[PDB]
């Protein structure tokens, strides 16, 4: 009947959440009632599962306010944020030595995320992978894609682009797509090779240098040409800054197309991805669709259509204010937080270190697992609920294919995530020791993974 | 000074009492080096006084008003993930409920289990895929059951966004798009039946036409798929493209029969930032039913409370934008909404009656209601000249601040010239006002200056 | 050598000196965003179901606050506007609990910065009132003693900073309060007052001053002693006068001579306000009034804090003008829906004896409940308010006091913010948990620590 | 009935009753918001290269004239401090301009709110200061001439308000200004002063008063006529000082009786800000001055306005404080940089003729131009500020007065915010609109409206 806060008949949101509500309502009531609600929203600070970024930046929040209504896809009324657009495709593309385009322009897109960029990377092989078949005769109906253990868009984009998935099985001692079984899964009938630049599920780099000697191989040994698409999510805003040594990127000449997310190690505000081609030979202009505008016409190879420009001119201040020098400086912070937990979390159990936050293996991250056959006690399902309790979200899970058996505890060591709050996390990490040494009944209760996907 | 021009990282700045850095000497490379944050701020916000303001822009169909509500819900909203439910669990419920809200605006059959079968999106592109793989694999599924190959399919449509040219090429279904062409500009039954054999997905009226603001009704095309499934067995689906009228039709004119109250619709897309009210970068698509949204597509993550199904091409993205939405639903309801849109076809129909008097004008739509949405569009009777094209009428209004885009049709009537001008929530009756006075003032300017006439020859931008 | 991956910078580390004071400054900026970012890691109390105080947010109060930043209390003289605020502030709340009509238009009382203040003025008030009149009688002042129930503990305080002996009536099973036959069992010529709690802090129930100030009646008619009250109205101070006027627990009777709330819980004011009102001059006795000069005379103070900010009271103030006896009736009314709603669901759900179910008539907003003795449904309250804490909940279980030692209650405090949805939600968390619990039997009888129970 | 899309409400129209004061009340905030929408159709300036004010935005500045809507200018007593620091404005900019130092610690002058109030000011001295001298002579003092060159529009106003008669030296081809030799032949025992314009408007020169300065002393020597000059330096006052101290202009000279300049140009202050100051009292007329009392004395002004607001003195202030001879020589050097690069990619382009090309030794940052005569490269400059307006530009194209009437002339202005960036952008989109007049022949000679060019 009533409500507190405005002293006054109440409105439910719970109530005929079910329908489209009949009557209007005071503009400040509808935001205060939703204002209170998001309050039970977490602020992910101590969110140890996600890359995404949730550090809080006044600029970026005065950016993203100034944009809200600007809109990304009419580059007519808001010729100003296109170019800032163009701007970053093209340091994107140096970031990842992209060949020096003939037309002063790099080939590429800003995206929604990782996702969309991945779906025109695929999309982009698939045709590249027809074209070759159709020019010497070849069916063209069985398409397939070998990979390692890849993020879930590549899943979808297999699924929703009818291509067999050829993912190589995570398994002891290999947790990764290595040469030899990636090339027993080629054929004639794959569109590409994806190598995942830092897995989500472990933190690692698979690299793709030795793959790439292992393609050039596989030509001299039986005529059949297989390119790249490098999945750089997390890796691709990394080692440019911290490792230039690790050649991943154009610098290979099967990799044909890159994509990276800006909202995770890129250090925009979600809703920012990067997908790069090395020339236009690797986009088939069929996939470009060309709009007129006044000034001309823009072609355009996007999922998404309209939507805010906000994020690219965020993605763009991180560019501008960093830098080379800064982002270097950033992202060895966030290495060396990762060290420093592998480090000191290595002291309190009987742990076995698939990651260990090194900047010349992958990404700011700590995996690990129960050393097989110890028992301290615990499972790291238990030990990630004790977590919870101190406010943490430290993700226990399974690792996949032949590595089923295998529970991984994932630290991720993301921007805001400082030294100061490695520190309180490890009084945290000991104090669930102590507890579930005190209340050993514990042992075995917890069994369901956390999110990690992203 | 002996330090030559070309070895200088050069350059004072007025603004900042100091040397500065160019944005454009070096926007081809990665930056080297830092720059005080707020040197960098200042310098963006400075270059984005360049960007229009769209106030003036009436080709455009996006919000683009400012309510200070919806800032500070977008603003506490950057970092909160809307794929993440479990970090942000009442993002998640709002959602859901803007989900079941949609739904039963759309007269969805009530769900068995209380939750509408439907998604959020970025926008309509992203609905329109999502609704044009469903509607492949249902399509898909049924032929095998049957049989029959698969590798053929068809998509059969009228004057559709770009979004559907890009779903038909990217995955690989062939588009018959019934042509527009001199007195009939939209897909019909007779052309739709013609197009239309075993092989259709589905057909897909756009129940509010880009180019023009019209509204394709699906009822008479659903009567012939009726008709036609019982001449001939084949039984064929619909999903109606809804960008914009999916957002007006429900308040202003709720007995356009358009929408799951047709049982071959089987889905339908809309934008929530267009006539939704919600700010950039919102989209809705809603199934019938836990039957027409094929499982396969439809990937379940596990998270802490067990597992959540998403159908969605998009993955972490900010989840400011429906929760600005929810606010619009809350706010206004259907009173609300009814008064907001009724506003704009006011001024549309306003602006038809008024821009008829001036010129000799032929119209496709007038913002009537029953009609279409917001919007008025014409081109100049046939064979008559009036000293002017309607690109030449365009250039002098962007000389007085407007955006009023002329382009051409597709198909047969490529030749047909139309301006069209959009109605959204902010262009109030006084704004209108201004745009006919300055609409005249051009007339006049053209009339004192005939070798105007025919030198603008550019489209401007059409799809949104 | 160690960054900061958020100033691009050499790490400042807060745990590193901690313990010295720092050496060398810093960039403010830098500092400021430091301890921000720390902020974070605590709790936002929305949750918190454990607390009475205020956690809601209103624009108007911020602003006012921040204005009121540097606006000292104490100093009248350059402040005076808020002097003038604070004191039509007291003349509100005394009227609100029917104080006599004061010979000099302004009633007799102070602004706190809470109920343990108050309390602690309440109380010295109480024994400088006893010691005078036993002084006059030519008696003993040395063995003073104060009769209470299951008192807060800022009178635990007050009776170990003062050398009271606290007579503190035992909860017991049947009777978890104050009742007038122990209360009289208790009382006696040396003691300084009897404290009803109206609102006791662990159940949410009223102690009902009405039957213990017959009792004192009586007493005094059996026996000469003349004994008054201090009524504890931490929380039933903003409650009863607006959802309950015929509850009679104020200045209506006679013994009351002086009652205490807190403006920080349900008088809706921010942290950092509380109130003590006394019937008129005689109940406060002038010695304990300290008198400062000042430009335009002097001010009488009585307070155990000095300087301190007046944006609380300013605050108070905004609440009592915004809303009046209408508003507040309506505000206390929908957190009474709360509880009462909860009380019922909870109830669906397992063997539940309840002590509190948010009756208006009864108690504060609050529910309070038991398990069933014997009935062992596959947890303890321990074990739900942790699965309770894992999906955000803080709804504290712990210990009665006393002869019910044994009792093992849950307290859900319903303060304003947290509306009908909310409690739908926590249902639903509460279901949830429970559903867990039963698929998880080893769970059972792990958890043990109470929870903070206090405020 | 009528509704409006952005209240969901009945439609309320500012352009129906908008020719009788409206009769009812509306809710305050859709006023605001009505009023905030009809103000997105002003321009922003950014992209307007025709005007000379400050169009740029620095928090600090928005802070302080937010801080200042009601401190009045005018009221010393209840402002004092504003009074204070507007004084410290008078001797800074006294001292720059080498003003001889006061026999009493402060200089003769003040704050207007603009160049306009400031030439009056000047206008009416030296008027009264010839007034007295006649006088003294018996001779007929209702005819006083003005002698000047291509004087911006408050010299038109000041000799009608105040019937003068202004002898106007015209513009004429390889002549555009007022040299020694036609200033001479204009004067005589009439003219009130001579106005030299140190930094003409119509073309970003400056004139220079030393040479003019020594005609005067010949004329003197000649005559016997003793004429002072006024400098209007509205631009020139704040940009020579800083980048060519050297050229001699100012108090420097002895003739020189008083100076006026704009704040609000490259003085960098906001809006509503001008400055005019005398030599010393005797250049001052003491009749012109008038005293008010208040408490703490009395003091004078001399002023057509009276009240007004304090903030853009205060934002002056903010801006000499912020950056001294130190940082103003940065900040013009910046925007002459940007129009000398601009000078020199625009005649690559097509056939001009430069009048003025952004050297400090010559003027201010400001490009101007003309076509070649009897050259034709397919457009007017008026057509080119046409398409430059699509793009979203304003680059003015007018023609010249006297018996350059002939002349068409483009003009650049480049103030503080105008940087190198967006010089590159305006440039790009010149090319673009040469590339299109090209393509395009039958646009030639369409347009011919000239374009404000005044301020």
Same mark, same amino acid.
């Given at each position: 009947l009533l409500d507190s806060r405005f002293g006054a008949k109440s409105i439910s949101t719970i109530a005929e959440s079910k329908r489209f509500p009949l009557h209007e309502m005071r503009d400040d009531v509808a935001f205060q009632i939703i204002n209170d609600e998001l309050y039970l929203d977490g602020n992910a600070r101590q969110n140890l599962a996600t890359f995404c970024?949730?550090?809080?930046?006044?600029?970026?929040?005065?950016?993203?306010?100034?944009?809200i209504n600007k809109n990304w896809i009419d580059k007519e009324e808001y010729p100003q944020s296109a170019a800032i657009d163009l701007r970053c495709v093209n340091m994107v593309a140096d970031l990842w030595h992209a060949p020096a385009p003939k037309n002063g322009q790099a080939v590429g897109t800003n995206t929604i995320g990782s996702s969309e960029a991945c779906m025109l990377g695929g999309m982009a092989m698939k045709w590249r992978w027809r074209k070759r078949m159709e020019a010497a005769g070849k069916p063209t109906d069985?398409?397939?894609?070998? %990979?390692?253990? @890849?993020?879930? %868009?590549?899943?979808?984009?297999?699924?929703?682009?009818?291509?067999?998935?050829?993912?190589?099985?995570?398994?002891?001692?290999?947790?990764?797509?290595?040469?030899?079984?990636?090339?027993?899964? %080629?054929?004639?009938?794959?569109?590409? @090779?994806?190598?995942?630049?830092?897995?989500?599920?472990?933190?690692?780099?698979?690299?793709?240098?030795?793959?790439?000697?292992?393609?050039?191989?596989?030509?001299?040994?039986?005529?059949?040409?297989?390119?790249?698409?490098?999945?750089?999510?997390?890796?691709?805003?990394?080692?440019?800054?911290?490792?230039?040594?690790?050649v991943w990127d154009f610098r290979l000449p099967r990799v044909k197309s890159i994509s990276a997310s800006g909202h995770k190690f890129g250090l925009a505000p979600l809703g920012c991805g990067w997908v790069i081609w090395r020339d236009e030979e690797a986009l088939p202009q069929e996939l470009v669709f060309n709009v007129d505008y006044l000034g001309g016409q823009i072609g355009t190879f996007a999922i998404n259509f309209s939507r805010p420009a906000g994020q690219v001119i965020a993605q763009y201040y991180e560019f501008l204010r960093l830098g080379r020098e800064g982002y270097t400086k950033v992202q060895n912070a966030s290495y060396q937080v990762a060290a420093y937990l592998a480090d000191e979390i290595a002291k309190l159990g009987p742990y076995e270190f698939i990651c260990t936050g090194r900047p010349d293996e992958g990404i700011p991250a700590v995996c690990f697992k129960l050393k097989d056959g110890e028992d301290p006690g615990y499972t790291l399902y238990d030990l990630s609920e004790r977590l919870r309790l101190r406010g943490w979200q430290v993700p226990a899970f399974t690792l996949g294919g032949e590595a089923t058996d295998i529970v991984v505890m994932r630290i991720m060591c993301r921007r805001g995530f400082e030294m100061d709050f490695a520190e309180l996390l490890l009084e945290d990490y000991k104090a669930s020791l102590k507890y579930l040494s005190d209340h050993p009944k514990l042992q075995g209760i917890a069994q369901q993974n956390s999110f990690k996907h992203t």
């Open positions: 970024q949730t550090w809080d930046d006044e600029n970026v929040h005065k950016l993203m306010d100034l944009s069985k398409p397939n894609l070998v %990979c390692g253990p @890849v993020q879930i %868009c590549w899943h979808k984009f297999a699924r929703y682009w009818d291509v067999e998935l050829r993912e190589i099985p995570m398994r002891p001692g290999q947790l990764f797509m290595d040469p030899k079984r990636m090339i027993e899964a %080629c054929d004639e009938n794959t569109i590409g @090779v994806v190598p995942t630049f830092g897995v989500t599920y472990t933190g690692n780099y698979e690299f793709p240098q030795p793959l790439h000697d292992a393609l050039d191989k596989f030509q001299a040994d039986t005529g059949i040409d297989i390119d790249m698409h490098i999945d750089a999510a997390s890796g691709g805003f990394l080692a440019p800054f911290v490792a230039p040594d690790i």
